[PDB]
């Protein structure tokens, strides 16, 4: 399949080189997989999700997204226009309030919820979670991310936007989940992106157009935008039978565009997520 005039990030993820604007992907499109977005929730009624999004959990007075952030991420994973996996099922877990904040304890409870809740969902092709959130190092938070992963969910988490070493951040510093840095459309590291030996991969994170609340769209930036590219790419590859939750991050790093990014600090990976689709 070919989506012309795609958002740049989508075109990039299916290209060996920057500067193109068509997104190419197998038409299976992540059908039969599931992605959890653990964030400020999802405006499920957005036309762009076409019935494939649902809220399954909130820790606050409402499950609606009063912020927009989680809706944006969700649209990058799986909306028809702005998403990588255009046919995946989307599950929203609201651990952050409408100011985009959440206590560590709620975030942890949210991760354990998904690790049980995937047993209540239909996802023959596999299960992914996109965690675009971040805070100072906590072994409790890391540990929660490690359980989510070990239960059989491909876990992808934002490196963080501090332009610093991600070792000091959770769940970014957890070794067993996929930590995701942000790149821009000229193949440079995003200026806010964290870096470090703990990163596994880079996705598109600067000027990323996707869904927003009130049924609209906007462009915004962050490792939180890059993360759903990788989360959607895993779901897509899993429905293709190419990989599993347990080895997805590894597979994505093996098949990445290598050595193509600029401003990558010595000792951080120079890997850019890539779907290897032969159209
Ligand atoms: Ca990691």
Asked if the peptide bond before residue 171 counts as cis, ω within 30 degrees of 0, the response is yes
- Dist. CA 5–CA 145, nearest whole Å: 36
- CATH number, residue 68: 3.40.50.200
Query: Which residues, other chains included, contact 174 with Cβ-Cβ below 8 Å and sequence gap of 6+?
Result: 141, 142, 143, 145, 146, 157
> Can you give the residue range of the structural domain that contains 179?
1-279
Resolution value in angstroms: 2.3
Query: Which residues, other chains included, contact 126 with Cβ-Cβ below 8 Å and sequence gap of 6+?
Result: 33, 34, 154, 234, 235, 238, 239, 244, 245, 248
The gap from C-alpha 20 to its chain's centroid, in whole angstroms, comes to: 22
Query: Which residues, other chains included, contact 101 with Cβ-Cβ below 8 Å and sequence gap of 6+?
Result: none
Task: Please give the tally of structural domains in the chain.
Answer: 1
Give the distance (Å) from ligand 1 centre to CA of residue 159. Answer: 9
- Dist. CA 65–CA 131, nearest whole Å: 16
Give the distance (Å) from ligand 1 centre to CA of residue 119. Answer: 25
- As a whole number of Å, the CA-based R_g of the chain is 16
From 39, 97, 165, 184, active-site residue = 39
189 backbone dihedrals φ, ψ, rounded to 5° = -55, 130
- Dist. CA 193–CA 195, nearest whole Å: 6
- Helix, strand, coil proportions of the chain in percent (round to 5)? 25, 25, 50
For the chain, the distance separating the N- and C-terminal CA atoms, rounded to the nearest angstrom, is 7
- 69 catalytically annotated: yes
Give the distance (Å) from ligand 1 centre to CA of residue 157. Answer: 8
């Amino acid at each position: 399949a070919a989506q012309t005039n795609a958002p740049w990030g989508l075109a990039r993820i299916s290209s060996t080189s920057p500067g193109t604007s068509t997104y190419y992907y197998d038409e299976s499109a992540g059908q039969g997989s599931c992605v959890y977005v653990i964030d400020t929730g999802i405006e499920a009624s957005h036309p762009e999700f076409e019935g494939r999004a649902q809220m399954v959990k909130t820790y606050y007075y409402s499950s609606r997204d009063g912020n927009g952030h989680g809706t944006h991420c969700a649209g990058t994973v799986g909306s028809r226009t702005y998403g990588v996996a255009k046919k995946t099922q989307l599950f929203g877990v609201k651990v952050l309030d409408d100011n985009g904040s959440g206590q560590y304890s709620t975030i942890i409870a949210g991760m354990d919820f998904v690790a049980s809740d995937k047993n209540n969902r239909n996802c023959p092709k596999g299960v992914v979670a996109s965690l675009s959130l971040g805070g100072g190092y906590s072994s409790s938070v890391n540990s929660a991310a490690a359980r989510l992963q070990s239960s059989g969910v491909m876990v992808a988490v934002a490196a963080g936007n501090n332009n610093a070493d991600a070792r000091n951040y959770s769940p970014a510093s957890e070794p067993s989940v996929c930590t995701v840095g942000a790149s821009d459309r000229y193949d440079r590291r995003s200026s806010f992106s964290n870096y470090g030996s703990v990163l596994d991969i880079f996705g598109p994170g600067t000027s990323i157009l996707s869904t927003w609340i009130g049924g609209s769209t906007r462009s915004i930036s962050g490792t939180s935008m890059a993360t759903p590219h990788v989360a959607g790419l895993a779901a897509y590859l899993m429905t293709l039978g190419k990989t599993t939750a347990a080895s997805a991050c590894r597979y994505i790093a093996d098949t990445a565009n290598k050595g193509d990014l600029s401003n990558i600090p010595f000792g951080t990976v120079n890997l850019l997520a890539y779907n290897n689709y032969q159209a």
